[PDB]
Design an enzyme around this catalytic site. Structure first.
Site, PDB file in Angstrom:
ATOM      1  N   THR A 149      86.405  55.060  14.135  1.00  5.27           N
ATOM      2  CA  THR A 149      87.626  54.501  14.032  1.00  5.27           C
ATOM      3  C   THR A 149      87.206  53.232  13.252  1.00  5.27           C
ATOM      4  O   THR A 149      87.614  52.351  12.825  1.00  5.27           O
ATOM      5  CB  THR A 149      87.888  53.941  15.613  1.00  5.27           C
ATOM      6  OG1 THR A 149      87.102  53.619  16.302  1.00  5.27           O
ATOM      7  CG2 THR A 149      88.912  54.922  16.493  1.00  5.27           C
ATOM      8  N   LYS A 203      88.165  50.572  10.178  1.00 11.75           N
ATOM      9  CA  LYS A 203      88.581  49.085   9.880  1.00 11.75           C
ATOM     10  C   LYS A 203      87.922  48.753   8.992  1.00 11.75           C
ATOM     11  O   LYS A 203      88.550  47.626   7.785  1.00 11.75           O
ATOM     12  CB  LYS A 203      87.010  48.264  10.950  1.00 11.75           C
ATOM     13  CG  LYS A 203      87.384  47.925  11.679  1.00 11.75           C
ATOM     14  CD  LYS A 203      87.588  48.800  13.639  1.00 11.75           C
ATOM     15  CE  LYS A 203      86.501  48.678  13.694  1.00 11.75           C
ATOM     16  NZ  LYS A 203      86.980  49.621  15.744  1.00 11.75           N
TER      17      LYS A 203
HETATM   18  C1  LIG Z   1      81.221  47.559  17.712  1.00 11.81           C
HETATM   19  C2  LIG Z   1      81.741  48.890  17.654  1.00 11.81           C
HETATM   20  N1  LIG Z   1      80.934  49.636  18.179  1.00 11.81           N
HETATM   21  C3  LIG Z   1      81.622  51.052  17.817  1.00 11.81           C
HETATM   22  C4  LIG Z   1      82.952  51.628  17.560  1.00 11.81           C
HETATM   23  C5  LIG Z   1      82.932  52.840  16.014  1.00 11.81           C
HETATM   24  O1  LIG Z   1      82.726  52.599  14.923  1.00 11.81           O
HETATM   25  P1  LIG Z   1      82.007  54.777  14.658  1.00 11.81           P
HETATM   26  O2  LIG Z   1      83.591  55.248  14.000  1.00 11.81           O
HETATM   27  O3  LIG Z   1      81.958  54.326  13.313  1.00 11.81           O
HETATM   28  O4  LIG Z   1      81.558  54.937  14.927  1.00 11.81           O
HETATM   29  C6  LIG Z   1      83.680  49.641  16.558  1.00 11.81           C
HETATM   30  C7  LIG Z   1      84.465  50.130  15.814  1.00 11.81           C
HETATM   31  C8  LIG Z   1      82.994  48.809  17.243  1.00 11.81           C
HETATM   32  O5  LIG Z   1      83.727  47.969  17.114  1.00 11.81           O
END
Ligand SMILES: Cc1ncc(COP(=O)(O)O)c(C)c1O
Ligand SMILES: O=C(N[C@@H]1Cc2ccccc2NC1=O)c1cc2cc(Cl)sc2[nH]1
Ligand SMILES: O=C(N[C@@H]1Cc2ccccc2NC1=O)c1cc2cc(Cl)sc2[nH]1
Ligand SMILES: Cc1ncc(COP(=O)(O)O)c(C)c1O
Lengths: 805, 805
Positions: free
Chosen positions: A645, A649
């Protein structure tokens, strides 16, 4: 000022100020002479909190009388972040508070920086829960979030001598203005004890009680007057010698003390199992009571969504309650249960699967084990009938796993006791059907679905990137804020010089503001005229921060070989936490800093390459760095990231993506056009083929001189002269035990990174491609995701109709 | 209605209601439809709390600019009780709130019953601290109360099968509306570690830190607009594996978890020592900082009052700070310390004396031990010079006690490091000089004083006995409320038929209300036309609840012998807690209930004698039973009760006293006339004479047939047929190991009780004698006591001048 942040009504400002000053005196017991920015933050928080109250009461009462189907979102994590800004945004109070605080001689953004994150999650799954609560409120769903109020959330990360240190996240230290304790709605949860099988059936007795004290936090919908509820349960002792007995109350209270910092890894701690049962049992008592305010209608009034297998005990718990206490027949109860429950799967990595030892369940939750055996028997009875004589299918599908220690597969329990099972992006959802739950898909195809993940465009755009939100609004109005597919209208501005100018201008402002934050907060200096290349996410081998490291070292070694050759300057930023016990992840953090130690102090390099590790990556920090980012690193090994996710972003906030055809990257590329994404490396098919003949990293080392060089830099101790063999485990792993095939994507990655730079040298065409990305990120709204949940699983219709006043 | 409770101003009521409804909505997040009496209590509490705020800020700021001498009242206990009623009374808001709640359809007294006691004390010493904070605010002193915010106060007592059970007193369960957290004024306290003696002197290093988080509670003066502060410190962890480390934070947080329930007994628990140092160190950091906002003026700006030896470490702590951190010379620092500190002694019983093992102090507080040895050396150097060659005086006066284990006498430390030492009533204060600190009195006579105890006539009259307060006010106005010697004016009403009528009428109303409370709350029935004979206080051998038991059994056996002979009906009530580990006290509670089991179910007795044990005696319950009481049992062995204060409560509220010439009983009798008190038993002189030839209980048994009978009832199992020898330890103790000579006062007591009854048969003359008691209780105002402290120890002038608005 910014029109998307609403109106600074003259009477509104006046009233805001009055009420600010009221709380400072009556709530904080301060005069303007002793008051600190922290007192000022809290007076604001109270003032703003007061605007939720009428809607919070009105919303819940409106559900009582409309009696719609209630959605219960069970999660061991809600990764909420701060709530002051979010509350102002969803209530159209932002510009007004900003003016009111301005007239009082205060900078509201400075005040916001005092608020502690509610960091009650680890990463994606936890944040998805948070975006989901937001989108359910904005879609007018009578949705309740149900979790645990951890005393300590995800550890505060410090970096010392290049190494991660963990400190307790004491987030309730100064109070939580946003939550409301409901000690009067406290409930008993039972552990241990044993089963008496008698006359009105089984009886669970001789249990130890732990009380569950609910705390309710308001969940505001976007400008629709809806305020839903997040209920988080806190553990309390019921009512050696006297003193020790009073002190020993801590043991039961330790149930809600701290979030387990294992992201996508299964540890088998009893205290964890207690946490899972705690949340499940207290929540279901609430659901039943509220239902009662006969059980055939129960699934027409109740949906329980299981965020992973973590609250999977909801299945045997509901059965327990229906059968033992409500005295429904088993079959009746089981029909009810399955139609109530649905299960979201978040990862295919075997070691994150919850498989609890049978002895453990037997001891802590005897009646649940019995029920789980009975579930297994009847379920395998169904398999046997549908697939006569298929014995191996039987042992594969079994809720019970044989071995030196017998365990319960909690995923199997979830599929068996749920009417729907979903993955979190298309590719992941299909692999569930094709391979990993192929047998279950074959028994009951109709259970299996996809719900591709999303992020809320409130938090993840308006909140964090008001500059981008405003230039979009200038063209197409504000409807897109809760209707994100309207961002498509921006493709028509791809040759619009004003829009091209503004998009680039907004990004440069975000980069300046981020540089300032790093300078303020860490006295770290970054070159503002550099490509900001950001990989932020939890530190794991599968996410391949090490591949990123290989590239960074590649750029450094190429610079040193040809010093005179122009390269596009880069600030490469890596951030994310490692689980306290994952040694390798911790070694990778150290390697990142150690590369910085060499790279960032080489005069020949100067400001053309910097490598920095962003400390304490968390929701508030994501909101700062993501709007600042040019390049979004999403470089998991193909097949390993179910969705992601963070990827979404970055797309929403004007970064271009470099990535694999993994998780939702695939759908994002489909949405934008692959021409508009830097896609590289093996596809899932190529990973599989490499597994069939076996991955030999030595081949890649023997055929790539640049890679060979880097590895010898590591081995020989070029990145740790004081400690020459510091990085031997990383070398050994990559050379001989690499599950995620880092060397196999090295060349394609480095080449792809060259194209990235090539494009960045053409500002106009970079920005035009960015426009193509923003314009096409609408699919990735969590409102879209939640509406599919509502229509395809829960059986409810969403709505964006305003509630009155 | 009652004029002493003030005016129900029309705009005041309107505003009160508005603000009640405001808090219910905004603070409690309730509508009138879901609201419980608990929500209603809290909306009131917030509404009433808001009226303190302006005065609390104004008062503290007024001290900042007037810069008077600050008084610091250090106590391990503040036995506060509830604060809603007290706040309304001191703010003249009672009648107004009563009307406002009345117009909203609520009974305010019912709402008050929801408030939990702050029961952060054990008995007298703890309550004296509470009355003292009240009187210091009412006398306009810049006084700060400094203690510990126990998570759990004095255990909740239940009685099961006639036996006391202890349950945790979870008094913060539903929140504390009255306190204000000041996490920003948090302070580090150090334990363990070791001493480095180097260059700028000694250095305490390698300590473990525990944070001290202050919580401030408002202390309202009686109608003078003063609101002083009680600061209570809460323990917090500073910032096995990660999880265990986070959970292990509980260990340091256990410092403030629970009040030690040892009343007048010394246990030597390290956790207790930590509690004492915790409060001392955090408090002194506050005192110094606030002083700084050179140390010669320090005693002109600072008084530290030590409530017993419990915060005695303040003496070496201040020295530590002055010498190690401020780098004053030792002698300079010691002059400062002694002139700052004064010490209140509360008991002569040897086993309540704090004598801490030297190994313990060495380990937990190394630098303090060093300092204490240095104090001892120089102090015994002074003894030696003043009394050359008196070696035994040396070992007697020594801060250091020799034995199998060396200990520090904390009383000796207090006398050495304090400019004043007081007892808590005249008889006690004299015995300190004559015997137990005779040697210290001889070195420094000028140190030794008396400050006879007192109780606040706010709590202990207006609050709890508004009916009595009103009929007094009708005659003599309201000035007596903060000028209690004016009660003398009531001696002129001793032949006043209206006043005689009203006094008796008020008592009967209080008895009806108490009966109702017992019926409501316990379904216990008491004969309203009985003499209410009440012994309430902590359960101890020295307080002789067993003597009371002997009498009760005497009355029962006399009734059974002569059934036809009229006796004045009695309801004899005993209440009070036993320390969880004091077996004998627990046996005595059981004996009380067991006597009730026989007595209360004998048809021949019917309603002419009842014996009941009042469960969970505590401040709120004292406020209920004391205004209901006819006879006040104050029957300690002569020499054993330093003062008492419950005695004073009863005198102020229209009970007659039966008692020994012990503690403040002596002064009360002097104040009222001995004709007006039921004084009996041995004086101190007779106790001593009996000790010289040895106490032989068998003599008393062999010469008193009635006593012999009772003892055989106990031994033989008349009061425990199912368990014949249940009471053998009590029998054995009384017959062979009685330190408090119960049998020696039996006859005089029983006879004296006969006179009590004789008088009670003449209602008019009972009430006239009661008038003589009330009229003469003025000396026992804590305002009187505090003004002597202010003038004779602290060197400050008290004042009852209103602060503005
Ligand atoms: C603080 C934080 N950690 C993890 C995620 C997830 O990111 P990813 O999909 O890159 O693991 C998000 C979106 C985040 O806001
Ligand atoms: O915490 C709240 N209220 C308590 C109630 C209380 C009870 C006992 C003692 C003190 C307090 N103080 C509060 O602020 C509180 C009010 C609101 C309104 C919200 Cl929206 S979220 C929220 N929390
Ligand atoms: O507890 C108080 N205020 C807090 C401040 C706060 C900070 C952070 C989060 C929530 C809250 N809520 C309060 O009620 C409080 C206000 C007052 C006024 C008093 Cl007099 S005694 C007293 N206590
Ligand atoms: C609850 C409570 N305990 C103990 C005491 C002291 O009473 P006594 O002097 O009889 O020990 C008082 C006054 C009280 O309010």
């Amino acid at each position: 000022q910014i029109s998307v942040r609403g109106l600074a009504g003259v009477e509104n400002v006046t009233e805001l100020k009055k009420n600010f000053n009221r709380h400072l005196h009556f709530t904080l017991v301060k005069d303007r002479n002793v008051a600190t920015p922290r007192d000022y933050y809290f007076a604001l928080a109270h003032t703003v909190r007061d605007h939720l109250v009428g809607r919070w009461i009105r919303t819940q009462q409106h559900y009582y009388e409309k009696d719609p189907k209630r959605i219960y979102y069970l999660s061991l994590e809600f990764y909420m972040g701060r709530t002051l800004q979010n509350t102002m945004v969803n209530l159209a109070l932002e510009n007004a508070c900003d003016e009111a605080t301005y007239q009082l001689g205060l900078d509201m953004e400075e005040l916001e920086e005092i608020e502690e994150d509610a960091g009650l999650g680890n990463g994606g799954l936890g944040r998805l829960a948070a975006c989901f609560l937001d989108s359910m409120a904005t879609l007018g769903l009578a949705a309740y979030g149900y979790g645990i109020r951890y005393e300590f959330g995800i550890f505060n990360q410090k970096i010392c001598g290049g190494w991660q240190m963990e400190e307790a996240d004491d987030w309730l230290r100064y109070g939580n203005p946003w939550e409301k304790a409901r000690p009067e709605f406290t409930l008993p949860v039972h552990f241990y004890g044993r089963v008496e099988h008698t006359s009105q059936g089984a009886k669970w007795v001789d249990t130890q009680v732990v009380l569950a004290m609910p705390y309710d936090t308001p969940v505001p919908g976007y400008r629709n007057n809806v305020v839903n509820t997040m209920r988080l349960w806190s553990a309390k002792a019921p009512n050696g010698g006297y003193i020790q007995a009073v002190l020993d109350r801590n043991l039961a209270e330790n149930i809600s003390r701290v979030l387990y910092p294992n992201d996508n890894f299964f540890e088998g701690k009893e205290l964890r199992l207690k946490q899972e049962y705690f949340v499940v049992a207290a929540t279901l008592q609430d659901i039943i009571r509220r239902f009662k305010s006969n059980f055939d209608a129960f699934p027409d009034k109740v949906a329980i969504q299981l965020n992973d297998t973590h609250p999977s005990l909801a299945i045997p718990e509901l059965m327990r309650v229906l059968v033992d206490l409500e005295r429904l027949d088993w079959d009746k109860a089981w029909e009810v249960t399955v139609k109530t429950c649905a299960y979201t799967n978040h990862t295919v990595l075997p070691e994150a699967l919850e498989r609890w030892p049978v002895h453990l369940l037997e001891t802590l939750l005897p009646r649940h084990l019995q029920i789980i055996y009975e579930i297994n028997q009847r379920f395998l009875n169904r398999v046997a009938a549908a697939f006569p004589g298929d014995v191996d299918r039987l042992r594969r599908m079994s809720l019970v796993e044989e071995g030196a220690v017998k365990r319960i597969n909690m995923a199997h329990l979830c599929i068996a006791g749920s009417h729907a099972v979903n993955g979190v992006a298309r590719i992941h959802s299909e692999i569930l059907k094709k391979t990993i739950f192929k047998d279950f898909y074959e028994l009951e195809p109709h259970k299996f679905q996809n719900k591709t993940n999303g992020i809320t465009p409130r938090r993840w755009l308006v909140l964090c990137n008001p500059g981008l939100a405003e230039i979009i609004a200038e063209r197409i109005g504000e409807e897109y804020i809760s209707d994100l597919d309207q961002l498509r209208k921006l493709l028509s501005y791809v040759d619009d010089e004003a829009f091209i100018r503004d998009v680039a201008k907004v990004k440069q402002e975000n980069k300046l503001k981020f540089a300032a934050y790093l300078e303020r907060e860490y006295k770290v200096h970054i070159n503002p005229n550099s490509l900001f290349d950001v990989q932020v996410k939890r530190i794991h081998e599968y996410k391949r921060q090490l591949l990123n490291c290989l590239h960074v070292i590649t750029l450094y070694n190429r610079i040193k070989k040809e010093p005179n050759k122009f390269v596009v300057p880069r600030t490469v930023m890596i951030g994310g936490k490692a689980a306290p016990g994952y040694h390798m992840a911790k070694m990778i953090i150290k390697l990142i800093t150690a590369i910085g130690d060499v790279v960032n102090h080489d005069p020949v390099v100067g400001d053309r390459l910097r490598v920095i590790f962003l400390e304490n990556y968390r929701v508030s920090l994501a909101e700062k760095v993501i709007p600042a980012a040019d390049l979004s690193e999403q470089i998991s090994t193909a097949g390993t990231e179910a969705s992601g996710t963070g990827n979404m972003k970055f797309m929403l906030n004007g970064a271009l993506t470099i990535g694999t055809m993994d998780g939702a990257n695939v759908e994002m590329a489909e949405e934008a056009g692959e021409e508009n994404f830097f896609i590289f490396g093996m596809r899932v098919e190529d990973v599989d083929r490499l597994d069939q003949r076996g991955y030999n990293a030595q081949e890649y080392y023997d055929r790539i001189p640049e890679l060979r060089q880097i590895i010898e830099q590591l081995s020989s101790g070029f990145f740790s002269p004081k400690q020459p063999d510091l990085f031997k485990d990383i070398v050994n792993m990559l050379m001989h035990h690499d599950r995620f095939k880092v060397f196999a994507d090295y060349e394609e990655y480095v080449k792809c990174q060259e194209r990235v730079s090539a494009l960045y040298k053409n500002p106009r065409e970079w920005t035009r491609m960015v426009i193509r990305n923003i314009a096409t990120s609408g699919k990735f709204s969590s409102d879209r995701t939640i509406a599919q949940y509502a229509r395809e699983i829960w059986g409810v219709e969403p709505s964006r109709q305003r509630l009155p006043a």
